[PDB]
């Protein structure tokens, strides 16, 4: 009845995520709404691999060493990474995004569990499941965005002649 | 019939017109032939709202549409070259010229309006044969019109379509604005007279020769719209090779049609560039004409805005073309 | 309807010539290229050329040359093909036909 | 249409005149 | 169990479906393959209105009038059409497409049922379940054919300066 | 810092490099205002590529990137209006003047990489002060050289860079092509000083005016291609109002910069240009300026090419609106 | 770097010289 239940639910996030390839802003924050009432967290946070660096914007622009820290490392290993206790804080869910081949592509982390002591280790498949949807939107989102900002420039030039 | 027409109108007053970017109609380098009816029309409508004209002239949306589709229904489709879409590239070109090469900046509203109308117009009715025949040939428009014969007509069809009901698009004008307006038009479809173009052109090319020509002045101002024009109404001779290649394909024809005539009706023998048989002593024909006609001008054309050079250079590269073809 | 009828055969002696008929009904020959082409006995068609009898141009192939002349006439709607300096060589079936002068080379219409 | 007479080939061999 | 399959099968044909907004013919050509085995059709042809005229190209291209035939009045009345028998034909179901508002946009009929008589009418809530995300999707990607069109002839030219 | 500068090569010599089309470097109303550094250098390497230059002389991508990256650092940041993106914005003109301005099609594969490498290094290593300045106080570089003081040492380095290992871009010429090249990129960049342009414009604004100017004469040309030189050097000018606004912000900051050193150092009074407190009489002295030395040349480029047009508008444009500005 | 000496003021009140 929970499983059958989790994907209505993730039927329902695909669909959310889906109808907003427009605007990787927007979407980017869908990710962060729905991730968090997934897993039930208190607050996520969303990092895109810039190169060689994180860079969770999420409104300010928030840059750092693309293997420092547990963004850094998940980052870098491309494997989920569950804590109890970290030491308001207390627990962290963080997992990788990856593209189609499993080039982690950015990171995600959710902090400290409502009603919980910290992260159900079915919160976790829960949260792979999820971080498909994640990399295959962003994944295209951000290729979309490429062209039109591209395209756009084209233009500016085309109608000067 | 009236019915097609009708709502070609209600789908065309009701369609939103594309930005002139999205209709690469900014450019030197522009061809039609993938364009359906309706798209040229929008083009139009695009061109007459980004000279500012639209607005400078109170045109009713409404007028304007009904007024476009009317000159698209009075060039004859049956023509090969000189249907709507030659009158469509010359506006075109006529404006990017205003655009890119930038001559806007160079001359007055009523100028500009008159110049687009114009070139829209410049050849209403057509029916694929050149002055020079309807001359020997006696038509009945040769009784009637003394020089310029078929230009004479063109226009007296562009005025009879602005006098038409809902399609007055100048009905905004102050009667001398409107008054003068016409004066200009009428000045602008005699001078694509080819005939015009050569008796005049020399005093022209001596004042961008010496250095002399200049704008300001009234007279010197009106020679250049005439040369313009022609500028214009041959611009299909600038065009990428593959276009060019397939334009000349149409006069090529339409000029073969003529020379069956003139010996059929007229029982003379034609000069070779409408000799339907000569087709094989089309480049060199082509080469001359362009030696003769055009590169003279284009460059020209320049002297007075640099910007306007693509006209030149595309001009030349085709002559390259043509003259390669012409040594098979 | 449309037709070409062509005159009838012709036992000529060598040395001599021959002037064949080609006669239009049902349609005006004016504005097409009248062919001809020639077929030899156990062989294939070949060629000859064609005249506009609009302005009477002709285009002959070069093993036709001062051997074939045709001429044609709009009004009464013939074209005709003189064979001269005749030899064994041209023992042949000669057929007319006629296409469109702005097609590039579908006949139609066969005498 | 009167042009000197040196032009008229020229101007008459394309549609002109 | 058999409504929690005719989900996780819609789940499955949403997920692919929009993996080729890319490509409206190709997509085109999933929302009939998946049509078919959903339904279970012998076949299915897909019409996108064009104005005044349905043009089920499904390859060569075939208009014809909007409100004529089957697919014209399912087009005009915008709702579903069922068939026992017509009169290897034998059924149809033909169903609208309609856009965010409720406007038909496109309009696709299955024929004959394979393994049965008709068209369950159960066979028709489904059809109109996945019809959704064939309006929601053909919608978005012809929209961003006209983008990458336009955008496109706006570059032709700008190269030309 | 080696070390910056090394990796900067790796993802430099390893990007794709967008179109010029996507790069919008086809336009004369272009801006940098909004790349980064990285974009800027591949936009270079696009205008390599699309002038043939890189398949025409064997240049290795690998190459290519280290040197221009090496030119991109020998600009002084410090340096207010005379740094990298300046050299950058110039080879873009020169860029846009061959293409759409359709030059090219009118000189040699030589010409055309010497122009390209001369655009790119005709200030290197400026140090924000003009030839009057080093000259009156006596800087060692006034003692090394004669005339062109700093366009003589902009070569030196040009030179001093192409010689560099890893970064020989010529390496591919026979050693005759080669020397010439070398010989044309001294002349490019030599007529960079705004002394010559003015003790030499003079001789080709009359070839123009007299109608006889003419590339195909070896001597006529080279004179041209100094006066394209000085054309895009100062292009700047020709921008769009919000650009050259923003453009001759720099240039007012690194003059008034060598004001204060005329009155510190040299204890003089400096020209009012380059006088801070009379920062109120800029736009009179942009408009004297542009009169006395643009206007003038723009016009000139575009009877020799009409497609170099929008470069004239943009000018006079420009003039306009510093006039207004002068009576406040 | 000699030029007119009419010249001078305009060449010098720009950057020139
Ligand atoms: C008869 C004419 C002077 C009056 N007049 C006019 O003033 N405008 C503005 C028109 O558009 C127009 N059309 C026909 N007559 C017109
Ligand atoms: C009036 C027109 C047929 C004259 N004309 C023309 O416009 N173009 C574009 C040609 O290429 C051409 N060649 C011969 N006449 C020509
Ligand atoms: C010393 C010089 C003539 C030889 N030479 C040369 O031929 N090419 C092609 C270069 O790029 C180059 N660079 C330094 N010397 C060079
Ligand atoms: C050498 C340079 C500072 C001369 N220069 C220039 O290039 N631009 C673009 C100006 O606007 C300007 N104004 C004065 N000097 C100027």
């Given at each position: 009845q929970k499983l059958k239940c989790e994907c209505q639910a993730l039927l329902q996030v695909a669909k959310n995520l889906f109808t907003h390839l427009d605007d990787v802003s927007v979407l980017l924050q869908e990710i962060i709404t729905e991730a968090r009432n997934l897993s039930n967290a208190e607050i996520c946070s969303v990092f895109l691999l810039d190169q060689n660096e994180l860079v969770a914007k999420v409104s300010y622009e928030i840059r750092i060493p693309a293997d420092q820290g547990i963004a850094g490392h998940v980052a870098t290993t491309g494997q989920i990474l569950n804590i109890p206790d970290a030491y308001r804080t207390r627990n962290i869910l963080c997992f990788p995004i990856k593209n189609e081949n499993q080039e982690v592509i950015g990171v995600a982390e959710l902090v400290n569990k409502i009603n919980g002591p910290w992260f159900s280790k079915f919160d976790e498949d829960l949260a792979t499941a999820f971080s498909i949807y994640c990399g295959i939107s962003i994944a295209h989102s951000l290729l979309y965005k490429k062209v039109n900002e591209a395209q756009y420039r084209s233009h500016l030039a085309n109608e000067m002649m | 019939s009236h019915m097609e027409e009708t709502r070609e109108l209600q789908s065309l007053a009701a369609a939103v017109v594309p930005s002139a970017q999205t209709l690469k109609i900014t450019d030197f380098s522009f061809s039609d032939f993938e364009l359906s009816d309706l798209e040229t029309a929008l083009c139009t409508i695009r061109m007459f709202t980004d000279?500012?004209?639209?607005?400078?002239?109170?045109?009713?949306?409404?007028?304007?549409?009904?007024?476009?589709?009317?000159?698209?229904?009075?060039?004859?489709?049956?023509?090969?070259?000189?249907?709507?879409?030659?009158?469509?590239?010359?506006?075109?070109?006529?404006?990017?010229?205003?655009?890119?090469?930038?001559?806007?900046?160079?001359?007055?509203?009523?100028?500009?309006?008159?110049?687009?109308?114009?070139?829209?117009?410049?050849?209403?009715?057509?029916?694929?044969?050149?002055?020079?025949?309807?001359?020997?040939?006696?038509?009945?428009?040769?009784?009637?019109?003394?020089?310029?014969?078929?230009?004479?007509?063109?226009?007296?069809?562009?005025?009879?379509?602005?006098?038409?009901?809902?399609?007055?698009?100048?009905?905004?004008?102050?009667?001398?604005?409107?008054?003068?307006?016409?004066?200009?038009?009428?000045?602008?479809?005699?001078?694509?007279?080819?005939?015009?173009?050569?008796?005049?052109?020399?005093?022209?090319?001596?004042?961008?020769?010496?250095?002399?020509?200049?704008?300001?002045?009234?007279?010197?101002?009106?020679?250049?719209?005439?040369?313009?024009?022609?500028?214009?109404?041959?611009?299909?001779?600038?065009?990428?090779?593959?276009?060019?290649?397939?334009?000349?394909?149409?006069?090529?024809?339409?000029?073969?049609?003529?020379?069956?005539?003139?010996?059929?009706?007229?029982?003379?023998?034609?000069?070779?560039?409408?000799?339907?048989?000569?087709?094989?002593?089309?480049?060199?024909?082509?080469?001359?004409?362009?030696?003769?006609?055009?590169?003279?001008?284009?460059?020209?054309?320049?002297?007075?805005?640099?910007?306007?050079?693509?006209?030149?250079?595309?001009?030349?590269?085709?002559?390259?073309?043509?003259?390669?073809?012409?040594?098979? | 309807e449309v037709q070409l009828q062509q005159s009838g055969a012709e036992v000529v002696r060598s040395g001599a010539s021959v002037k064949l008929s080609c006669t239009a009904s049902g349609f005006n020959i004016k504005d097409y290229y009248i062919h001809w082409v020639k077929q030899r006995p156990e062989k294939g068609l070949e060629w000859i050329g064609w005249i506009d009898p609009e302005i009477g141009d002709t285009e002959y192939v070069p093993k036709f040359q001062g051997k074939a002349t045709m001429t044609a006439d709009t009004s009464s709607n013939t074209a005709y093909l003189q064979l001269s300096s005749l030899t064994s060589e041209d023992t042949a079936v000669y057929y007319c036909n006629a296409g469109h002068d702005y097609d590039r080379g579908r006949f139609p219409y066969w005498g | 249409e009167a042009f000197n007479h040196l032009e008229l080939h020229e101007l008459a061999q394309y549609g002109i005149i």
């Amino acid at each position: 009845q929970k499983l059958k239940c989790e994907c209505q639910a993730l039927l329902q996030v695909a669909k959310n995520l889906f109808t907003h390839l427009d605007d990787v802003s927007v979407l980017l924050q869908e990710i962060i709404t729905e991730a968090r009432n997934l897993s039930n967290a208190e607050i996520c946070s969303v990092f895109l691999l810039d190169q060689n660096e994180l860079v969770a914007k999420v409104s300010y622009e928030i840059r750092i060493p693309a293997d420092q820290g547990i963004a850094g490392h998940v980052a870098t290993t491309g494997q989920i990474l569950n804590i109890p206790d970290a030491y308001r804080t207390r627990n962290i869910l963080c997992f990788p995004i990856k593209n189609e081949n499993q080039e982690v592509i950015g990171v995600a982390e959710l902090v400290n569990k409502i009603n919980g002591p910290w992260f159900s280790k079915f919160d976790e498949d829960l949260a792979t499941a999820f971080s498909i949807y994640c990399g295959i939107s962003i994944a295209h989102s951000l290729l979309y965005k490429k062209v039109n900002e591209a395209q756009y420039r084209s233009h500016l030039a085309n109608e000067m002649m | 019939s009236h019915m097609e027409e009708t709502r070609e109108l209600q789908s065309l007053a009701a369609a939103v017109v594309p930005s002139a970017q999205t209709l690469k109609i900014t450019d030197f380098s522009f061809s039609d032939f993938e364009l359906s009816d309706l798209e040229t029309a929008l083009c139009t409508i695009r061109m007459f709202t980004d000279l500012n004209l639209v607005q400078n002239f109170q045109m009713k949306h409404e007028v304007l549409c009904r007024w476009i589709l009317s000159v698209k229904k009075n060039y004859r489709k049956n023509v090969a070259y000189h249907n709507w879409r030659h009158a469509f590239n010359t506006a075109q070109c006529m404006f990017a010229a205003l655009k890119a090469g930038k001559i806007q900046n160079k001359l007055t509203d009523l100028e500009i309006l008159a110049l687009l109308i114009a070139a829209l117009s410049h050849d209403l009715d057509h029916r694929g044969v050149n002055n020079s025949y309807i001359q020997r040939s006696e038509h009945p428009l040769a009784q009637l019109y003394c020089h310029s014969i078929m230009e004479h007509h063109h226009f007296d069809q562009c005025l009879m379509i602005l006098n038409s009901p809902g399609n007055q698009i100048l009905s905004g004008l102050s009667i001398e604005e409107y008054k003068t307006t016409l004066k200009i038009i009428k000045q602008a479809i005699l001078a694509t007279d080819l005939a015009l173009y050569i008796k005049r052109r020399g005093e022209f090319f001596e004042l961008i020769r010496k250095n002399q020509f200049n704008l300001e002045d009234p007279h010197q101002k009106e020679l250049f719209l005439a040369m313009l024009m022609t500028a214009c109404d041959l611009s299909a001779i600038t065009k990428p090779w593959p276009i060019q290649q397939r334009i000349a394909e149409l006069v090529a024809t339409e000029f073969w049609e003529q020379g069956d005539l003139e010996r059929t009706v007229l029982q003379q023998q034609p000069i070779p560039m409408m000799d339907r048989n000569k087709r094989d002593e089309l480049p060199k024909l082509q080469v001359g004409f362009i030696d003769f006609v055009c590169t003279q001008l284009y460059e020209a054309l320049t002297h007075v805005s640099e910007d306007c050079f693509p006209l030149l250079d595309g001009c030349r590269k085709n002559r390259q073309k043509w003259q390669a073809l012409a040594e098979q | 309807e449309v037709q070409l009828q062509q005159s009838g055969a012709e036992v000529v002696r060598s040395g001599a010539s021959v002037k064949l008929s080609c006669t239009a009904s049902g349609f005006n020959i004016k504005d097409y290229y009248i062919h001809w082409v020639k077929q030899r006995p156990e062989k294939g068609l070949e060629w000859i050329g064609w005249i506009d009898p609009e302005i009477g141009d002709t285009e002959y192939v070069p093993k036709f040359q001062g051997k074939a002349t045709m001429t044609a006439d709009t009004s009464s709607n013939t074209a005709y093909l003189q064979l001269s300096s005749l030899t064994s060589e041209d023992t042949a079936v000669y057929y007319c036909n006629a296409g469109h002068d702005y097609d590039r080379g579908r006949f139609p219409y066969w005498g | 249409e009167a042009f000197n007479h040196l032009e008229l080939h020229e101007l008459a061999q394309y549609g002109i005149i």
